Amino acid sequence: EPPHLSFRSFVNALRQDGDLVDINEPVDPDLEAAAITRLVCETDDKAPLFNNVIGAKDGLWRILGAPASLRSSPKERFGRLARHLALPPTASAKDILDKMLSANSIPPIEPVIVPTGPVKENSIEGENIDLEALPAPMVHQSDGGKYIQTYGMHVIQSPDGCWTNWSIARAMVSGKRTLAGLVISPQHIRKIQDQWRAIGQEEIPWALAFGVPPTAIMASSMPIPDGVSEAGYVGAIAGEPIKLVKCDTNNLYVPANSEIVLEGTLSTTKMAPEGPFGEMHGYVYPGESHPAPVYTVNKITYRNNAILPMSACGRLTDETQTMIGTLAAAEIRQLCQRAGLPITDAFAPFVGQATWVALKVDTHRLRAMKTNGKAFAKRVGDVVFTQKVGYMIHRLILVGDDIDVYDDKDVMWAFATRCRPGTDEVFFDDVPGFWLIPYMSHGNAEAIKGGKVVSDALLTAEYTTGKDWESADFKNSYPKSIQDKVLNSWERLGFKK
Amino acid sequence: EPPHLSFRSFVNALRQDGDLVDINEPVDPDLEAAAITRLVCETDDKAPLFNNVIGAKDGLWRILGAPASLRSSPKERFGRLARHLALPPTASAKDILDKMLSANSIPPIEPVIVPTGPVKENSIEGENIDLEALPAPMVHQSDGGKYIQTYGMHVIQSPDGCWTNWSIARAMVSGKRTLAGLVISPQHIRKIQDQWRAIGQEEIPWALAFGVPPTAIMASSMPIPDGVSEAGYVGAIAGEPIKLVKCDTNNLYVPANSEIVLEGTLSTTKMAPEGPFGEMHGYVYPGESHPAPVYTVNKITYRNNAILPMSACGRLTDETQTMIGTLAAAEIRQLCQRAGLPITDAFAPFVGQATWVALKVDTHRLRAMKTNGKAFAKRVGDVVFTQKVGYMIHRLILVGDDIDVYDDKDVMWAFATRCRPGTDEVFFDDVPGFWLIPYMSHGNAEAIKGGKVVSDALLTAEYTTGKDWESADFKNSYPKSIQDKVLNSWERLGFKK
Ligand SMILES: CC1=C(C(=O)O)[C@@H]2CC(C)(C)c3c(C)c(C)cc4c3N2[C@@]12C(=O)NC(=O)N=C2N4C[C@H](O)[C@H](O)[C@H](O)COP(=O)(O)O
Ligand SMILES: CC1=C(C(=O)O)[C@@H]2CC(C)(C)c3c(C)c(C)cc4c3N2[C@@]12C(=O)NC(=O)N=C2N4C[C@H](O)[C@H](O)[C@H](O)COP(=O)(O)O
Ligand SMILES: [K+]
Ligand SMILES: [K+]
Ligand SMILES: [K+]
Ligand SMILES: [K+]
Ligand SMILES: [K+]
Ligand SMILES: [K+]
Ligand SMILES: [K+]
Ligand SMILES: [Mn+2]
Ligand SMILES: [Mn+2]
């Protein structure tokens, strides 16, 4: 099976790219695995595969760190993400996002059922399960527990049986058979939890699959619409069905080649302390746990030589910045197009720590509307900031089509020189606010409301008669003849390549 | 004379450092010299010395591009700036700014007069001067003329004869005997021009000195206090006197080892079209000239084998960001400390395009003040935005003492995660605004007023009880024992040094 359809194939693809380190020396899942992974993420190095995890018993488990973090080589920067999606390792961030959006406007390719698969090679059931005895990583020294769940897919189905949601949400070991995990509004796992609560179901059938087909974990991190099952979306991206096997102890379906599956229930009543956790914005608050829902684990099934993927998230650059903001950006672009706004492209610049999205404006179309930045910024915010796909994003930066939104430097240049502070901004005090951002939960105003802005970084004339400047840069301030004469003589004269 | 006291010694210092390319092939000062210089600045390469400029006659002139731009080696990034100031090429940005501020707390060392110097080796006088015939560079294809003046020092003296100002302001060739150049409020060349206008002088004695002592060009770019002669401040930085020679045709004094000096007058009545120009924010507006004062040149004196320095400014990274923003940040730091604010450090992050200054707060001292972000942000903006040193800066970012303000990434992380948009900002509509920024002159509100902000990127607890988080990074989320084990294993395991 190809790398995009098998986590095991994906690991072999990273090994063939020279993008993986096999660590055969013993590594402690108590901080050491996470510390190596963190330094890989901070230096854009090769993905670490921990083949010798201290305390690993009965084939549980190896750990892969930094599954979707960046490569240092500029030409292959997004290569680990491209290997999730059958793209070449030289794929741009735009190629990745265009691919994830491609299933927006084709029929779903429905999953197919198989009677067994590698995920059924081993099992532990009922009283034999002790999650406290498994080598679950301590991901940050001040975390409130061992975060087993940083890169698995939660599988949960609506009461009408029509909607099977796949999503990533963190969870830590809580007890011998229990996890505690974030189940927050407006995420689909919480929307589905509340539907079961409302009809009186105490224990909701649930599964958590680790080392899923790479296309599936990408869809799990994407805010595709309410009531759309990720399985068919994934099939449409991959151009063929995901093969699913039924769980042994409930009626849910998991990918047949998953590394590890937990089967059990999500409670609508039982709560337990969850966190703290070193989260996507780069912060942990020692001692600050909050009640979260309890997951009960009734069976574990796993592959021989099982691998648990691990995101050691925090400061730049890990899966929380390469997947969460970027895939929200892709969905915000599509919402803006839906609403008839002249947006061609969107990206979440890494410098914004997954709180910023830059929206590229088709300025020809914009001039036909005969509007102004003040009116346009308000309309963009009113569309985006009252939708789930805009929940985590606190600053939208509107830029003209001379700016590459995929280049942090271009976006920051437009922001700093085209958006007059206060004057060119529209502030949103009444929309849902992402409480995980420190300036929200640990700030000066309501933790769950407001703190958003649309920054108009189009110059005044872009709305009326058009661009009337030239960049003072090599590309735009010198004629083609002069540029070519320089580039042809560059190395001969003594400059670097 | 050492490198920091002689431009010619400084050029040889860059050559000794392997930081200089001698281009002995013919290079056209019409766009080709600037195009090479611009690509050097965009790639942080070696400074280009054009030894064979097409149209050079009688020793006028060679050109040095990118005299104070960045090196590519991260340990010597600021080495070209350090060689202006008798600092090692490994000097930090903090070392450079501390050296430039060192003269504000010690008595000036007054310049010494010499009867002659290398700048008197050659002369062109009166009717023999034809500036349109000199190899003045065309710096950007859409500029309104040949900007001869991008890295020279204007010398102008007050009516009472006691204050001699040295500053950098652009000027272009206007005619056979004239330049036109920016003389804008609140700059000292404009304050002194207005002193002369008020007593009815039409033509003010003036000189422009190119390839001055590198310490002198750094002070020329720095907003030292009103009425302080830069000569004595430069002496104090260097710890010895600048040697000055009198001009032949007026009573002004210029560095005796300058490469090239123009002697003449600055008009108080006559203006000529000036610009457009590819300016510090990265923009040229083709066809958009504005009236500026006329300089008349009556004599040229120059060294054998004279070198004209040239700044091909625009997009990152050239002299306008390495010197203008950083030296303003230095003066803003000193202003904050004189106002009694707990500011330890300040820098102008390159991503702000010399419009942002980050201010590092002593949070132990802040807590002793018992204040809050709203009150403190307003006080900082009131102190800074009502002073000349704050004029070019539109955004101040206040950060706690865990942020390295010299590191653009740490500043952006603090700004993105610790400053609630709107809520944590104080906007300034009534202060002077820097019209050259496109969102000012080409924006939605008054070109010369407002458009400023202080962003409070201190979390709420920093003002009261103290830092209550840990960064989710390698340095802060893992114990020293774990960090040491990982660092000691790193290369053996197969990761990059
Ligand atoms: C906010 C999140 C995390 C955190 O910062 O603690 C935590 C970190 C980890 C586990 C590493 C993490 C990774 C590595 C990735 C790649 C994504 C997330 C997370 N975690 C969180 C979480 O615990 N809760 C949550 O609300 N969303 C999270 N997402 C994002 C969601 O997956 C995304 O919003 C989906 O679109 C949701 O699917 P639908 O509801 O639309 O079907
Ligand atoms: C704003 C400026 C420029 C521009 O962007 O066009 C232009 C570009 C060049 C020449 C390359 C340039 C360089 C390479 C450097 C290093 C500095 C400047 C400039 N130019 C300008 C200009 O034309 N007018 C201006 O008002 N200030 C300028 N400074 C900054 C001043 O030197 C500084 O503000 C001093 O502090 C002023 O001294 P005092 O008055 O305090 O004594
Ligand atoms: K393997
Ligand atoms: K239902
Ligand atoms: K999803
Ligand atoms: K604008
Ligand atoms: K020389
Ligand atoms: K000066
Ligand atoms: K704040
Ligand atoms: Mn969903
Ligand atoms: Mn001055």
CB contact under 8 A, B419 and A439: yes
Q: Which of residues 41-80 of B touch A (CB under 8 A)?
A: 42-43, 45-46, 72
Tokens 């040239």 map to which residue? B310
The answer to whether residues A80 and A117 belong to one domain is yes
Question: Please, what sign has the CA dihedral across residues B177, B183, B189, B191?
Answer: positive
Which candidate from B45, B417, B496 shows the least CB-CB separation from A438? B417
The answer to whether residues B7 and B111 belong to one domain is yes
The answer to whether residues B378 and B471 belong to one domain is no
The span from the CA of A11 to the CA of A87, in Å, is 15
The upper half-sphere exposure of residue A189, i.e. CA atoms within 13 Å in the direction of its Cβ, equals: 25
Q: Check if A352 contacts B (Cβ < 8 Å).
A: yes
Q: What is the largest CA-CA distance in chain B?
A: 78
Residue A167 Cβ contacting ligand 1 at under 6 Å: yes
The DSSP call for residue A102 is G
Is the Cβ–Cβ distance between A325 and A317 less than 8 Å? Answer: no
User: Which tokens in the block code for residue A27?
Assistant: 């590594």
Residue A221 Cβ contacting ligand 1 at under 6 Å: yes
Resolution as reported, in Å: 1.8
The answer to whether residues A319 and A343 belong to one domain is no
The answer to whether residues A312 and A364 belong to one domain is no
Which candidate from B424, B444, B461 shows the least CB-CB separation from A420? B444
Q: Check if A31 contacts B (Cβ < 8 Å).
A: yes
The span from the CA of B238 to the CA of B86, in Å, is 8
Chain B residue numbers with beta carbons less than 8 Å from the beta carbon of A413 are: 282, 315-316, 351, 353
Give φ, ψ of A283 to 5 degrees: -130, 145
Q: Verify whether residue B279 is a known catalytic residue.
A: yes
Amino acid residing at A235: G
The answer to whether residues B323 and B341 belong to one domain is no
Q: Among B472, B474, B467, which Cα is nearest to A353's?
A: B472
Pairing of strands A47-50, A62-65: antiparallel
- Concatenated DSSP letters of A48-72: EEESSBTT-BTTB-EEEE-TT---S
CA of A310 to the centre of ligand 1 (A): 13
Tokens 């150049």 map to which residue? B181
CB contact under 8 A, B38 and A477: yes
The span from the CA of A230 to the CA of A167, in Å, is 9
Q: Among B146, B148, B143, which Cα is nearest to B314's?
A: B143
Cα B107 versus chain centre, distance: 24
The answer to whether residues A88 and A200 belong to one domain is yes
User: Which tokens in the block code for residue A305?
Assistant: 């030589």
Is the Cβ–Cβ distance between A370 and A380 less than 8 Å? Answer: no
Is the Cβ–Cβ distance between A494 and B55 less than 8 Å? Answer: no
Question: Please, what sign has the CA dihedral across residues A437, A440, A442, A443?
Answer: positive
Is the Cβ–Cβ distance between A126 and A304 less than 8 Å? Answer: no
Among residues B305, B330, B355, the one where a domain terminates is B330
CA of B170 to the centre of ligand 2 (A): 7
Q: Measured between alpha carbons, how far apart are the two ends of chain A, in Å? A: 40
Strand partners, A357: A396
* Ligand with an atom nearest the CA of residue A226: 10
Residues A279, A331, A425, A462: which is the catalytic one?
A279
Q: Measured between alpha carbons, how far apart are the two ends of chain B, in Å? A: 41
The answer to whether residues B96 and B220 belong to one domain is yes
Q: What is the largest CA-CA distance in chain A?
A: 78
Amino acid residing at B381: G
Cα B123 versus chain centre, distance: 30
User: Which tokens in the block code for residue B180?
Assistant: 């036109």
The span from the CA of B267 to the CA of A428, in Å, is 51
The DSSP call for residue A149 is B
The DSSP call for residue A435 is T
The number of domains in chain B is 3
The span from the CA of A42 to the CA of B487, in Å, is 13
Among residues A286, A304, A330, the one where a domain terminates is A330
Strand partners, B245: B254
Chain A residue numbers with beta carbons less than 8 Å from the beta carbon of B281 are: 417
Mapping DSSP onto H, E and C, the string for chain B reads CCHHHCHHHHHHHHHHCCCEEEECCCECCECHHHHHHHHHHHHCCCEEEECCECCCECCECEEEECCCCCCCCHHHCCHHHHCCCCCCCCCCHHHHHHHHHHHHHCCCCCCEECCCCHHHCEEEEHHHCCHHHCCCCECCCCCCCCCCECCCEEEEECCCCCCEEEECCCEEECCCCEEEECCCCCCHHHHHHHHHHHCCCCEEEEEEEECCCHHHHHHHCCCCCCCCCHHHHHHHHHCCCCEEEECCCCCCEEECCCCEEEEEEEEEEEEEEECCCCCCCCEECCCCCEEEEEEEEEEEEECCCCEEEECCCCCCCCHHHHHHHHHHHHHHHHHHHHCCCCEEEEECCHHHCCCEEEEEECHHHHHHCCCCHHHHHHHHHHHHCCCHHHCCCCEEEEECCCCCCCCHHHHHHHHHHHCCCCCCEEEECCCECCCCCHHHHCCCCCCCECCEEEEEECCHHHHCCCCCCEECCHHHHCCHHHHHHHHHHHHHHCCCC
Ligand 2: which atom is nearest the Cα of residue B181? 23
A171 among annotated binding-site residues? no
Is the Cβ–Cβ distance between B494 and A21 less than 8 Å? Answer: yes
* Ligand with an atom nearest the CA of residue A417: 6
The DSSP call for residue A464 is T
Element (H, E) at A427: strand A425-428
Q: Check if B489 contacts A (Cβ < 8 Å).
A: yes
Experimental method: X-ray
CA of A190 to the centre of ligand 5 (A): 12
Is the Cβ–Cβ distance between B451 and B436 less than 8 Å? Answer: no
Q: Which of residues 299-318 of A touch B (CB under 8 A)?
A: 313-316
The DSSP call for residue A320 is I
Q: State whether residue A470 is helix, strand or coil.
A: strand
The answer to whether residues A168 and A230 belong to one domain is yes
Q: Among B132, B136, B157, which Cα is nearest to B265's?
A: B157
Chain B residue numbers with beta carbons less than 8 Å from the beta carbon of A38 are: 473-474, 477-478
Residue B182 Cβ contacting ligand 2 at under 6 Å: yes
Q: Among A211, A427, A396, which Cα is nearest to A303's?
A: A211
Tokens 């498994």 map to which residue? A134
The span from the CA of B233 to the CA of B259, in Å, is 21
CB contact under 8 A, A39 and B490: yes
Ligand 1: which atom is nearest the Cα of residue A188? 40
User: Which tokens in the block code for residue A496?
Assistant: 């670097």
The span from the CA of B452 to the CA of B447, in Å, is 12
CB contact under 8 A, B423 and A413: no
Q: Check if A25 contacts B (Cβ < 8 Å).
A: yes
Q: State whether residue A436 is helix, strand or coil.
A: coil
The answer to whether residues B300 and B445 belong to one domain is no
Is the Cβ–Cβ distance between A71 and A204 less than 8 Å? Answer: no
Which candidate from A351, A439, A486 shows the least CB-CB separation from B420? A439
* Ligand with an atom nearest the CA of residue B373: 9
Q: Among A310, A40, A67, which Cα is nearest to A172's?
A: A310
Q: Check if A464 contacts B (Cβ < 8 Å).
A: no
Residues comprising chain B, all counted: 497
CA of B188 to the centre of ligand 8 (A): 8
A492: left (phi over 0), alpha (psi -120 to 50) or beta: alpha
Q: Among B320, B434, B424, B409, which Cα is nearest to B358's?
A: B409
A165 among annotated binding-site residues? yes
The answer to whether residues A433 and A491 belong to one domain is no
CA distance B306 to chain A (A): 22
Contacts of residue A36, Cβ cutoff 8 Å, sequence gap at least 6: A23, A27, A48, A50, A65, B486, B489, B493
Tokens 């404006």 map to which residue? A361
User: Which tokens in the block code for residue A416?
Assistant: 């700093």
Element (H, E) at A196: helix A188-199
The span from the CA of B50 to the CA of A477, in Å, is 20
- Concatenated DSSP letters of A385-417: TTSGGGTT--EEEEE-TTS-TT-HHHHHHHHHH
Chain A residue numbers with beta carbons less than 8 Å from the beta carbon of B423 are: 439, 443-445, 450-451
Which candidate from B23, B444, B460 shows the least CB-CB separation from A442? B460
Give φ, ψ of B182 to 5 degrees: -70, 125
Range of the domain at A483: 460-497
User: CB neighbours (10 Å) of residue A7?
Assistant: 28
Q: Check if A285 contacts B (Cβ < 8 Å).
A: yes
Give the burial string for A173-194 (b: 16+ CB within 10 Å, else e).
bbeebbbbbbbeeebbbbbbbe
User: Which tokens in the block code for residue B156?
Assistant: 């102008």
The span from the CA of B321 to the CA of B282, in Å, is 10
Q: Check if A473 contacts B (Cβ < 8 Å).
A: yes
Among residues B273, B306, B330, the one where a domain terminates is B330
CB contact under 8 A, B459 and A468: no
Residues comprising chain A, all counted: 497
Tokens 């960064």 map to which residue? B471
Interface test with A, best of B30, B469, B471 (most A CBs within 10 A): B469
The answer to whether residues B69 and B33 belong to one domain is yes
Which candidate from B313, B444, B489 shows the least CB-CB separation from A424? B444
The span from the CA of B243 to the CA of B256, in Å, is 6
Pairing of strands A307-310, A62-65: parallel
Chain A residue numbers with beta carbons less than 8 Å from the beta carbon of B472 are: 140, 278-279, 282-284, 313-315
The span from the CA of A102 to the CA of A4, in Å, is 16
Is the Cβ–Cβ distance between B371 and B410 less than 8 Å? Answer: no
Ion ligand 4 — residues with CB < 5 Å: A 158-160
User: Which tokens in the block code for residue A188?
Assistant: 């689909």
Cis ω on the peptide bond leading into residue B67 (within 30° of 0)?
Answer: no
Ligand 2, atom 19: closest residue by C-alpha? B169
